Structure formats: structure tokens, C-alpha cells
Write a protein that binds this ligand. Sequence first.
Ligand SMILES: Nc1ncnc2c1ncn2[C@@H]1O[C@H](COP(=O)(O)OP(=O)(O)OP(=O)(O)O)[C@@H](O)[C@H]1O
Ligand SMILES: Nc1ncnc2c1ncn2[C@@H]1O[C@H](COP(=O)(O)OP(=O)(O)OP(=O)(O)O)[C@@H](O)[C@H]1O
Ligand SMILES: Nc1ncnc2c1ncn2[C@@H]1O[C@H](COP(=O)(O)OP(=O)(O)OP(=O)(O)O)[C@@H](O)[C@H]1O
Ligand SMILES: Nc1ncnc2c1ncn2[C@@H]1O[C@H](COP(=O)(O)OP(=O)(O)OP(=O)(O)O)[C@@H](O)[C@H]1O
Ligand SMILES: [Mg+2]
Ligand SMILES: [Mg+2]
Ligand SMILES: [Mg+2]
Ligand SMILES: [Mg+2]
Lengths: 53, 107, 357, 335, 357, 359, 188
Amino acid sequence: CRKDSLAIKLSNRPSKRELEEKNILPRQTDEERLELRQQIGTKLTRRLSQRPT
Amino acid sequence: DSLAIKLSNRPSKRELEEKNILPRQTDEERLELRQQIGTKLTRRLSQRPTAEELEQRNILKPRNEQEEQEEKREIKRRLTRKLSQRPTVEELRERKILIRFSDYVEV
Amino acid sequence: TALVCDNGSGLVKAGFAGDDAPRAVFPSIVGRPSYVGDEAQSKRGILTLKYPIEHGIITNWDDMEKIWHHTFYNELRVAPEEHPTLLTEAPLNPKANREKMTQIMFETFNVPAMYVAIQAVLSLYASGRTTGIVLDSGDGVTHNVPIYEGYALPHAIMRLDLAGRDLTDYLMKILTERGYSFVTTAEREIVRDIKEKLCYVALDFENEMATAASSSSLEKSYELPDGQVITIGNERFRCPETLFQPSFIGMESAGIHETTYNSIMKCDIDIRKDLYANNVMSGGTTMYPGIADRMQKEITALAPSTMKIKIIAPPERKYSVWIGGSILASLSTFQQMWITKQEYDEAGPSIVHRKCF
Amino acid sequence: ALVCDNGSGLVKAGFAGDDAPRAVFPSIYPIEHGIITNWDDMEKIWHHTFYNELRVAPEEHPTLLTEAPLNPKANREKMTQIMFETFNVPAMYVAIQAVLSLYASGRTTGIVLDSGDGVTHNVPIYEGYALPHAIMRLDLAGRDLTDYLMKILTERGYSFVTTAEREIVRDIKEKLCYVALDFENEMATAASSSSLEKSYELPDGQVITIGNERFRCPETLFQPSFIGMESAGIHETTYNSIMKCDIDIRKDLYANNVMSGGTTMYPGIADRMQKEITALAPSTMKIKIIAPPERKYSVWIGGSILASLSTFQQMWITKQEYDEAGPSIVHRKCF
Amino acid sequence: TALVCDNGSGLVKAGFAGDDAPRAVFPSIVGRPSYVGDEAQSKRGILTLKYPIEHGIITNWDDMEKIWHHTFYNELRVAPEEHPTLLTEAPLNPKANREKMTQIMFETFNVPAMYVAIQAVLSLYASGRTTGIVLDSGDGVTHNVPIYEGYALPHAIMRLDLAGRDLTDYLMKILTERGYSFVTTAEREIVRDIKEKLCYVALDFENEMATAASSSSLEKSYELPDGQVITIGNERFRCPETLFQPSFIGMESAGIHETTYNSIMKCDIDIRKDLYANNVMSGGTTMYPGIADRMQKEITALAPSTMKIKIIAPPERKYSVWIGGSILASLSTFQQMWITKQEYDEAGPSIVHRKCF
Amino acid sequence: TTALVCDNGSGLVKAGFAGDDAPRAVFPSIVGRPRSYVGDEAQSKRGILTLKYPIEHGIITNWDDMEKIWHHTFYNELRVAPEEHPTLLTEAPLNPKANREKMTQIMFETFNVPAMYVAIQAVLSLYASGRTTGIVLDSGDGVTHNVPIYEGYALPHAIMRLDLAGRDLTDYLMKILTERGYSFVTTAEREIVRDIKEKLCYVALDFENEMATAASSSSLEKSYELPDGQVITIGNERFRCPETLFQPSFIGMESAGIHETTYNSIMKCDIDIRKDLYANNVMSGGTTMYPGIADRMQKEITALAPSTMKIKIIAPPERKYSVWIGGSILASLSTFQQMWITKQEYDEAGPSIVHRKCF
Amino acid sequence: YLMKILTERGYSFVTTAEREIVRDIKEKLCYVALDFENEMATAASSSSLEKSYELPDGQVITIGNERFRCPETLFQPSFIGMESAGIHETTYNSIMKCDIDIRKDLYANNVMSGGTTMYPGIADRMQKEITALAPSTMKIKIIAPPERKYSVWIGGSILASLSTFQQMWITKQEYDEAGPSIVHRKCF
Ligand SMILES: Nc1ncnc2c1ncn2[C@@H]1O[C@H](COP(=O)(O)OP(=O)(O)OP(=O)(O)O)[C@@H](O)[C@H]1O
Ligand SMILES: Nc1ncnc2c1ncn2[C@@H]1O[C@H](COP(=O)(O)OP(=O)(O)OP(=O)(O)O)[C@@H](O)[C@H]1O
Ligand SMILES: Nc1ncnc2c1ncn2[C@@H]1O[C@H](COP(=O)(O)OP(=O)(O)OP(=O)(O)O)[C@@H](O)[C@H]1O
Ligand SMILES: Nc1ncnc2c1ncn2[C@@H]1O[C@H](COP(=O)(O)OP(=O)(O)OP(=O)(O)O)[C@@H](O)[C@H]1O
Ligand SMILES: [Mg+2]
Ligand SMILES: [Mg+2]
Ligand SMILES: [Mg+2]
Ligand SMILES: [Mg+2]
């Protein structure tokens, strides 16, 4: 029945980890995301400033 | 008959790793870990503050407890003494110490 | 505020510099009785649809101008003359092609500034690196691009015309062999969704085939829009297996691990260690669960026994190209890097080669 | 198995496999805004549920309880502790209300708007998983609508101050209120003619006439400023919740808006929600609003379904497991 | 046993009279969806947080009541009706404000007795003095308070809205300029710790700048929570230099040495000698190594050539204010000084002005 | 040149080479004389000859016997020439000045070492985990200490000492097993019980609840087969035994438990470093090997500390020997090579030099 | 030497790992100044020559004149307390010890090989110094290909792959006949 479409759908549901890797459930705060993006940005500006010809 | 008894008392694999019986990491892993710890230790011991530098931060006091007690006693004495001889707002006014009348008026 | 435009063979990703994710993502199609992207797909029944970008290279300039127009006006709702624009390009993009991109950006859309960055390079930047080897696998094309100090190494670049679209097609074929019929475009979209939701890369392919034949542990169920229910078994991992064994679709080409290794080997030996320790995966076709572990295993199998191997595959990687651009265009030191309208007026299409490298 | 939906206003309780709850009764206030705050009173409520309403022995049935979105870890831990220690159940489970509502419609992916007596939530859910970062909470619900209706009825010239009178006003709200598709046009229509007017017969046999109030009352859900709140309306919170989710699942969320709870029972609410969400979303986005007739109890229904599935049987927390892990176990076993 | 409560702009210090150190020290914040201090900060994401004391003066009384309740019940685990209570107040605290403090203490918490003391005065008392000039620099505000025989001299008090928080922000700015990124609140906390552990006050700023430009001898390393390591150079001494050169953060104000001098000059000439020979430093922002010596140098540079200058800066100074209270409330002769609850009914809020000075 | 590391326990000496991951030789600290053998050999001949304990509660009290132990360590166990190796020794917290001076004198004059160093056990324990700041709970055979350390400096004013350790736990286990009706009065019986303690004991997370579990079912019961082939069943004794560490009143002691002493030690330190102490509790010593002790300590410390304080208990599986490991690391650092007290320096300053040079 | 001068700067590089890091700094950032005094003056005048290196721990250090002072030792060995002539002077001396007739052929063919010749600018500096030492009319050519770090090996790879080389190998049989002695006749 409809409870069979539901039973077949419930049986299929992935782990929380699986959603996490699929970027459906984030692994960090928007703040932490900001930290990371900032660090990346500064490292990048440094290496680019040093970048050889 | 003894076997089954010994089989009922079997630890979990985790519980064995807890006793440092089963390694939780490869030899190479333990080595890299040791090297890391070592470099950390080196760096920290390099910038290790001095005894005086750690005294001034109030981390560890030099004076014995009795010495401290003597300090906290002498201070209380001098304080009660100095506070029981505390001039009136008028004495300070008259001596140009207080410049405004509104200051400590309600005393 | 600067704009970032990643021109995919399948999907255009567009947005504003400084943002963590693209504001608009839409299929790169042009429909004529003009409709672009989602609207074209909606009107797909009434009119035939054409792909302006095939295998990562722009081939139809009128349609591309249509796509960019839709991007600026319909999707982002901005005036192009008010924003510096960073565009992406494929590895080994021909000189004339990028020249035409620059010319169109300045003359047609009157942007105050623009820049053209290599997709794989942006992918590398998004992870905060300037040296490493990128596997960029999208909808239309797959690349291995080794990069040192921001410079792509052209002689060691590998191009493979096997990507996500091809995997979708293969999945349609094998599902059909199982007995479910998927010939129409709408059915194709359904199969693509099945691929994205249910497919994964087996760590050991033979063992996984044996497991799939031995039991129902791998079987999954998909409910069609008609409410019909279908069961998918080994197709889950046989589909993306094509990346490692292109012979599944009749290609003589080596798999992505072999092309990664070969690309690494074509580079100077001294930087090779740096390349092995920095494998960045980007693009939608790298989103399959288990692909990083399989790549680790294969690269480990090909490389020297003592070589350090590291695969970088963040969950956000499907859009990482764009993210890189988003970071790059928001850096203060990048502001000088832009090609200004005055400079373009002075040097013409030629300036992009000098300014961008 | 038993199924218990612990509402701020109404407790819905019954047996698994049944189409409707056997017992529905006011929660008298131990639960405010969907979260349990008075534990002694809550224990009283659960006792009343087991013994008086359902006439069962708690030790003989696995028990599924519902909880609010963003329910604190300690709170569900206390629920579990009381269920196992006080009532000695052989098994129990704690499910998110919005998730059960979603399951009740045969879905495991979509976005639920759950509006009850005390609190309203937007909960986007993917593969049975609620996405905590994207959940929206709005402290505007049925009770507030009842109060607002009392105020506007006062503007009509009818006096409704007593609690019993409040209950009467609530019934008036349930029977005569509706959500206007276009609020301004409906106001103009209400001012132009008696076409919108309705009559309610009081118990004393007095008859009253209600005009634009019929749609001004639930309009508060879309315009909370009607009661002095600075918060956005339910359509905007639906949109915002959707926007906080990953772009790839966003399409899946738009095509699956499930509405549940008593405060979603207003006629016309689905059409209005459709219009507003269409107005906020991208022009080509497919929008579908799901609002079944059973929605007033759909949460409970979901539980009733879930607890009757064979595959759910492994999911129960057994009394032995609770004995082994304590309150901690609920977090691992239920998700 | 009496209680002692120092209501700081950043940190509340609370404890029992006679104790060497405060039993509880926690940030003075109030959280609403009630939460106080650290617990409010952990849950800071879920609920908005409000600062009841800004620049040393109480502005939000409900929030202050929340802080005091948390202090009595949660932190000290005592019944307020069972203990006389000494509160601290800022220099130049408005009359109505201290009246409200008194009113709330007696009516809301039903204390048997209480007293309100000026922070700088308590700082002076803690060193066993009743005459001298105090520099009390905390989280939100810095004061110079000249005191003669226990009397603060209101006409000569200096207020400077430059303190620890401003220094933390500045350190974030200059470390960011160095290329380590510190924009977030968690990063801000990290920077505060960096400031407390690695910063110091240069005796000669220009010479120290020259040494810093000449070599890496001054550079130090800080280990982030993720175990990543960062380097701090001249920022170590440029940060607290702001106290002497407020122009570093765009302030036109004179430095703390100049305000000390001006405060001393605003006093009657006869007591001036007594002020110069007794500079007591209190508050967290005086904890920088080298600050006493620098202050000695600058004050010597400003004062008459034959004037005796003595800077008193004990290791415990960060809490000396509280300590002073702890001493004061434990003196036998102080027992008469308390405002009794009966006394409060008789005179009302008015009584605090007469009884406490 | 390879340095040596010697951890002088009240019960067990751990000895080995710097740079090694684990001690080469671990043996009981006993000296046997006819009514000379050291350690295991002494234990085997224990019947024939009387035994003396050179180290009691972590502090050296019998120097001749200690010299015998050190000789046995160098020659019999490690097979080295002491004059050919720098030597790092460990000492107990609050070790008297004269005691460490005597250690130095004996090392240089008797064993003719080219260099040596004396380190606090708890400090080395902290170092083995790559830390220089934190609070160590070091519980061995004869004595237990809480030692707070900031930047490598032990804070003497805040050190807590508890004369309740592994041996006392063995005795208590003997007593409670005896109350059950199994007789363990004899020394051999003491050894079997000690093995029982090591194999079957653990620390309950909630002591009362675990007692209730033990009373409710046979689920906690385990079986141990004695050498005589007799089989015994053990229930709550499994967790009642190490509970003594948290409740010393179990053996008639008035002292606070280890969690309370940890808290007190933390409180005796300056408030500013206190946060750093709470986040770095390192457990070391054999008596910390009980499963569940870290979790219990976490719960109790969280219960005593302010509600929002971050608490982290560090208890690696190797912790039983972590002291030694620390020394092994410390003595293997390149930057440590200057830190050694050289024999020339000792010739110049005498026993006095150790105080200045080691801290 | 680079470790020594960086240490003099206030960066501590005592450990072996630190030595490896310094080696990496040398390989990545060092170069040979064409005019050493002028480069010292430029380094003293501005931050233009300064470069930045990020340590593995993420620590960041700044390196200035050490970039060219380090390999300058090759031209001025006295920098490390050696009395020896520099590589240019030893090149010149080597050329002079050869017959005069071949000197022209030697001057026109200076081949540089090995890792320590990888410093940018070393070929140009060598050109300048040798030009300064040689007769005014002598043709000087310095050959320093990018592959030079491995050119030794490369040469071998080529030599052993030549067809005409096939007779040149010392066979196991020949070794059996003559012993270790055979290498002298066969290899030259
Ligand atoms: N979760 C997923 N798992 C597997 N494949 C996915 C997933 N999501 C998207 N894809 C595939 O990725 C492809 C889109 O990738 P991407 O957007 O990187 O391509 P593109 O950039 O448009 O093309 P190109 O890189 O060739 O220019 C689609 O064909 C789709 O089938
Ligand atoms: N037909 C109707 N029209 C309008 N409102 C209705 C109708 N039926 C019920 N309601 C309102 O719905 C509310 C009851 O809904 P429900 O029992 O789902 O809330 P709840 O789940 O107890 O609340 P919460 O989820 O906050 O705990 C009542 O306040 C009632 O006024
Ligand atoms: N060792 C240290 N070195 C430098 N600064 C420190 C040190 N310790 C604390 N601080 C700073 O001192 C400030 C807190 O000082 P204090 O507790 O005296 O302020 P307060 O009394 O709460 O503020 P106010 O006096 O304005 O009410 C914090 O901003 C902190 O960064
Ligand atoms: N797995 C285990 N479980 C419980 N206790 C154990 C375990 N392993 C060893 N022990 C106990 O640890 C003790 C040994 O500790 P250790 O060798 O650290 O003491 P020590 O260093 O000789 O003494 P001190 O530190 O007082 O000088 C023994 O008494 C033993 O009973
Ligand atoms: Mg792409
Ligand atoms: Mg509900
Ligand atoms: Mg203060
Ligand atoms: Mg020990």
C-alpha cells in the first residue's frame, strides 16, 4: 500500500554521515566557515604575492 | 567446561585497545606522532618563561604563607588606623583639597 | 561587487564575489522556436534545444552571449557595466577562444573590468593551495591538471572526453539491460537523478560484483513519478566504474587514476612529491561516495612505495571551481589583476594573454 | 504500540494502526511552545493518558512519543528517563513531529509547516533527517489567533472576556474563519457588500454577524504585525528556511510543502501559500503545497504508521538498552 | 561573613570577605531568547546577548538584577539575606544610579546590610594606603583617581574610554595586517589570550621598533586550538603602546601617563607630593610586563625634576580592587559603616550618599 | 651516544634507552638479603631471604639498596656501562633537596656517568603527551599525586599528596573478596588477587547505579580460575575496589577522593591559569589503568567546576608507563643536550649543581 | 651557513627538522647576486628583496639578504672561514693548468652540473668573474641548462644507450679473465 512506498523509502534512508559528505548536513558553523574562508584568503594573497614568473 | 566460562569473560576489542594490548595505529603512525610531539615539546620548551616572569604573573608566589599572613595583618592594622583618623569634608574644604562644595555635600 | 561565472558544459554557476555558494545554477542550453536554461527545458517540448558549450569549450558565440545575457539580467538581476567579472575557462583553452571571450565581455556587455581563470586552478585556490594536481570532472569533460605556483603545466595536462553525461547515458543503457526502459529526455532526467542519488564507486570492483550477485545488500529502490517502483543493484557501482574502466563505454582511453599518474609522471621529478601530496578533486562527477578512497588505493598502487599520497575532496567540491573564483575576486591584491576597460581599449583582445596567466 | 503527540494545547493519544487517536484532550500549562517545562504535571498528563484515556498498562506496549523541532538534548533525555523508570515500558521511541507529519503523507523528503496551538515551525527534512540549521521557529499560533479574534470581535461590538467566552470565540474561529487569497481585494469586497458576512448562534441563542474578521484573524499568520510582532510571516519563513538549505535539495523542498497542525486548517491557506511562495521563489521553480484533510492529527497519524511498520521494530529503545546506557541512549537510537 | 562584588564592565568579581582572591570571576553579560556570563556565552548563538555595564556605569537594571541573582545563588551558593554586601562602583557614578543600586540591593534581595565603595579607592586600600593616585584600567574604561585620606577628589578624576577591549580589537586589526586572520568572536577570544600571554610594554617604543625591524629576536609563537602555529612580532608591544599613544586607534586623547600628570596637577599643590610618591595601578589592562617601568619613565619625564616618583604595581593587581573590598569589609571598625536594612527603611535610597564615601 | 631513562617507582622500576617507545626493562623495586638479589630474582628467592623496599611513597629512604637497584638496572637489565651513557632519572613531587643532591652524588661518583638529569615524574607525564601546561594525576604503587604544572614548572604550593595507591587497592580487594568468603590472607594469594584486580576491575561511572545493577542481575558477574583450578565468581568487587580512589573512606581514610583533590589542587593555583588546568588533566601511572576512570573523572570534575568550564581528561592506553615515555622523549630532544649536568660541572659545583640546573 | 645566518637573525634553527626546513628555504628562495655589494645595498635600502617563507607549522618567517649571502660563499669561501679560492678562481686556475692550445676550447665550454649550481643568477655571475679573469679578447661561454641538477645521470643515460657503446661494457667474462685490473684499460 502507501505504507509500502513509505516502508520502501524508510528502508533506503542514508546515514547522517552520508548526508554530511553530500553536503546536505554541514559539518561546521557559519562562523567557522567564515574563519576558514578568511584563512584561505590570506594564505592565498600571500602565495600570490610571492608567485614567481 | 572451562572454555565456555573463559568465553563468557571475553573483553571487547575496544576494551583490549584500552589496555594497550591491541595497537590502534601502525608503527609508522606512532613514529610520525612521536616526531610531532617532539617538535612541539622543542618549540614549547624554547619559549619557556622564567621563574621571575612567572612570579610577576602571580602564577607562583615566592613568599611563604606566614610571610603573606604578616603582610595581610600589617595592612589591616595600618588600614584601620588610617581610617579611624579620617578628616572631615570641612577640613579638606578649608585646605583647598576639595574645590567644589557639591562634592561630598550630603556627608 | 564583483561577479563570478563558471561556464560549465552542463551547468552555469553564477554569483557574487565573497559569497560561499553560487546564487544561480542552471543548465547551459539555448532553446529556439529564445529561451535559455531552465526556461528552455520547460519549453523543451515546443522547441529543439542546443548545447553552446561542449566538452568545456565555447563553440557557439551567439548562444553564449544569450547565456551570459540571461545570467546577468534574468538570473543575477544586475547591470554588467557596474561589475568586474571573473569568468572561468577550460584547461588548454585556445588563444583565439579566450580572446573572443574578452572581446565580447568588453564590447557587448561593457564591463568595467574582467578576468579569465582556469577552472582547475580556481579549484586548487578554493582549498587554499597554489600547487597540486586537480582532477576536474564535470558534465562534458574530465581533466587532470598539475599546477605549480598557480601555473598550469600544459605539457602534462590530460584531457578525457568522459564525464557525467556519459555516465548518465551508460546508466540508461544498463538499466535498460535490466529491463527498465529509459529512452526519452524526461526519462533521461529521471536516470540522471537516480545516478546522483543512488550511485557510488566500489573500493574493490570484483568483490562488489560478487556481493551484488550473492545478496540483496546492495539493492536499492527508486520510486518513479508514475509511482512505479524499480530496483537497482550493481548498476549503482557499475555506472561510475566507467571512470576507472572507460572500456565499459567502448573507449580505449585509460581510467582517471592512470591519467592522474601519467600526468604526474609527465611533470619534473622534483615537484612530483608535491603533486602526489595534493590531489584536489572538483566537479559534479567527483561527488560519488567512495571515489576518494578508490583513487587513494589506485594512486597508492601506481606510485612508489614510500610516496606520500593525499586526496583532497571536500563535500562542497561540486561547486569548488566557482568558490575559488569567489575567493580570488574578493581578494584586495587581486584588484590590480583585473583587465580594466581602458587597458582593453588600448591593447584589444591581446591583453588577456599578458594579464591572465 | 501506543502513539502520543504531546501538544502545547492538545495531547493526541492512541493505538498504533488506528486511523485516528482514541483520546484527544487539553494539556492542562505544562508544555509551552512545544517544549516540556513542568515535569510533575507532564508525568500527570502521561499517567492520565495511559490509565484514564486509553485504559492500558504501560508495561505492555512500546511507546512512540513526539517532540518539537530543536528539542534540547537534556529534555528528550528526561522524557526517556521518565518513560523507562516511571512507566516501565518495554520499548519507546521519540520522533520529531514535523518528520512524522511528512511520513504521514508518504514522504521522507520535503519541508513541513507545523502550526499548532502554541508554536509554529518550518522544518526542512531530507531522507527523514530534519536540517537543524534551517529550522525556523515562530511564536505565533492558534491561541494568539483566538486572542486577536477576541480583540477584533470587540471592535465589532461583541464582548468576549471570560475563559468560557474565549472557548466560544475559538469555536467561532474554527467554524467561520478563512484565509483570503488576496487580502486587499477581500477587504474591499467585505466593505462593498454583506456577501462575506456569516452568522454564529451562541449557546444563549444570541446570533452574531462576522464580516472581514473571518479572514483578518488568520491573516495574522502572513502579517504578524497585526498583533505587534516584528517577525516575518509564514511564507517568508518557509522561503528563508528553504534558502538556508543546500541548493541541490532546494528543488525537492519547493515541490513538497506539507502543512500540519490545527492552525493550518483554515480554508484557502494552501492557495495563499502557493501564491506567496510562487511570488518569492525563482520564476521557473515547481511549487506544490500538500495539505491533507487529516492534517489536524497528521503528526499523530505519522507516528501511528511509523510504529506499525515491521522495519521500525529494530529502531525501538529496549528497557535493557536504557539500563545499559542511561538517558544517553535516546540520542543514538532515535534520529 | 560579608560578600564582596566588583561589577566590572567586562568581568564580575565576587566572593567572601577575608579571602585572598575572588571565589568567582565571570563575564558580565545577560542572555535573552535568562542566562548570565559564561553560560550565556556558550549559548550565545541561540540567543542575543546584552552588556549591562558599559564604560563602568550600570545602564540596564533588569539585566543587572539577573547578574546579581546569578552571583548570589549560582556562583557563591549563598542566601543574600544572610550576608552584608559590599558593592563596587565607578568613579563619578551618578547619584541616582547608586541610589538605584542601594534600592535594588535592599528591597529586591532583602540584604541585612550593604555598602558601595569606589573601585580605585578599594584598590588603594588593598595596598594598605588611604592616600595616593590610582590608575584603574579594566575592560571598558580607564580612570585616574587621586585620593586623599580615603576621599576621591572628584574635580581631578580623569576618564578615558580606552581599555582592554579596545586593545584586543586593535591586536586583532594588526595581527590581521600581519596576515593572520582574526575577525570572528572565537578568534577574538583567541586574540585576547594572545594579548594576555605575549604582549608587553616597551620601555622605549622607537628603539624597540628598531630592534623589531632589525631582527627576529623579539618574535614569538602562539599555538592555535587546532594546533596551527602563528607568529607575533612588534604587535607584542605595539598593542599596549596604545595606552600611551591613543592616536594608534584614532583617539585624540592624551595617554595614561599624561592623564595621570593632569590629574595630579588638578589637585591642590600641598598633597601633590603625596600623589606622586603613591601611584597604585589596578585592573587587567595594567598587567602588561614593563608597564610600571614605562610609567615610571614617562611620569618622571613630566613631573618636577626633584619629585619622588613611585609606581606601585603588585602581581595581584588585576583583582586588587576586589581585594581591597575583601579587606575593607573584614575590618572591625568597618562594621559601623554598613547601611542597615532598618536604616534603609528610615532614610530610603538617600542614605547611601551619607553613609558611603 | 644514547641516553638512559630510569623511572624509580615505589613498586616498579621502569628502565630503558632514550628514543625507545617503551621501557626495555620493568621490574619490582625490592632488594633481597639472606635471613644479594634484586627485583624478580629477589621475588623468586623471597622465601629464602628477607626483602627490603628502598623506595617508599616515591621517595628514596634506603641508599645502599638503591645503589643495588641501580647496579642491577645498568648491568643486569640494560646491559650497559654507566660511564658511557647520559642518564635521566625521575623523582617524586616535593622530593627533598638533600635527597636529589644524594641522587646526583651517587650517579656521578659511584656510577661515573658522563652526564645526568633529575626530572619530576608528573612533569615528564605531561611532556609525553606533548604538553607543558596542565594538571597531572600520577597514581602508582605506593603514592598518588596531583601536580599542576604551568610551562614546565610544577607549582609546589598546589601539589596534593595521597597515600592511597595500587597496593592499597590490592589489599582492599583482598579484604572484600575475603568478606565474600574466599580466603586471600597469604602473600601468594595476595599476588593472585593483584592479578584479579588488574584483569577484572574497572571504575563505575555512577557508583550507586552500578551497585544497583550488581544487585539487580548477574550481568556484571565474571569468573576467574585460580591456579588450584578452583573457579570463583566476582560481582561488585570489580568496581568497589577502585572506587576507594574516589572514596578513601572505604579503607578508613579521611582524605578526599582523587577528583576532589584534583579540584583542590586546581583551586590552589592562580585563577588565570585555571582554565588551562581544567582542559588538560593528564592521568599517569598503573593505578589509572582501570577502564572507565577517565569518564568518571570527567563527570566528577564537571560536577565540581563551573558549569561551562571545558573539561578534558587525557588518559592514553600507554599511560601506565607514560612517565618513562616522557623522559624518553625529553632525553632524546636535541635541545635537551645542553640541559644535562656534565661530570665536569659536577666536579666544579658538587651535589649543589642539580638545583640550579634542573627545574 | 644559511642556518647560521638565519640564527643570527633571531630565528632558531638548531633541530634536524629545522635543518631540512632551512635546506628547503635555500632551494626555493636563494639566488646568486650579480654584484654582491650592490645587492647588499639594495637589501639595506628597501624591503624589495625580502621574501616570505611559511613553515610547516604554519609559522611565517621573512628572509632578506640571506637569499644571496648563502650561495655567495661559493665565490667567497672566506664567509665560512675557508682560505680556498672561489669557484671562479679555481675554474681559472684549472684552465691555466691545461695546455695553452686547449684553453680557448675550455673557456668557450663551461658546463655546470649538480644541485649547488641550481641557484638563479650563478651562470651570469660566473660569466662576469671569468670574463674579469680571462684575457680581454677571450670568448667566454657558460653553459647551465635547467636539467643540470641531474645532467650527470642524464649523460650516463645517453652514453649507455648509444649503439657504439655496446663494445665498451666490461663483460663478466673479461672480469673473470683479468680481475679488478680490467677497469683501468676498459674505462677512460
Ligand atoms: N551528487 C552527485 N553525484 C554524482 N554526480 C553528480 C552529483 N551531482 C551532480 N553530478 C553530475 O555532475 C555533472 C555536473 O558537474 P559540473 O557542474 O562540475 O559540470 P560542468 O562544470 O557544468 O561541466 P564542465 O566541468 O565540463 O564545464 C552533472 O552531469 C551531474 O550528472
Ligand atoms: N478548523 C480549524 N480552523 C482553524 N483553527 C483550528 C481548526 N481546528 C483546530 N484549530 C486550532 O488548532 C489548534 C490545535 O492544533 P494542534 O492540536 O495541532 O496544536 P498542538 O500540536 O497541540 O500545538 P503545539 O504543536 O504548539 O504543541 C487549536 O488552538 C485550534 O484553535
Ligand atoms: N595578563 C594580562 N595582560 C594584559 N591584559 C589582561 C591580562 N589579564 C586580563 N587582561 C585584560 O583586562 C581586561 C579585564 O580587566 P578587569 O577585569 O580589570 O576589567 P573590569 O574591571 O571588568 O572592567 P571595568 O573596570 O571597565 O568595569 C580584559 O579585557 C583582559 O583582556
Ligand atoms: N590494568 C590494570 N588495572 C588496575 N591496576 C593496575 C593495572 N596495571 C597495573 N596496575 C597497578 O599499578 C601499580 C603499578 O604502578 P606504577 O608502576 O606506576 O607504581 P610506581 O611508579 O612503582 O609507584 P610510585 O609512583 O609510587 O613510585 C601496581 O600496584 C598495579 O597493581
Ligand atoms: Mg566545471
Ligand atoms: Mg503539533
Ligand atoms: Mg575594575
Ligand atoms: Mg609512576
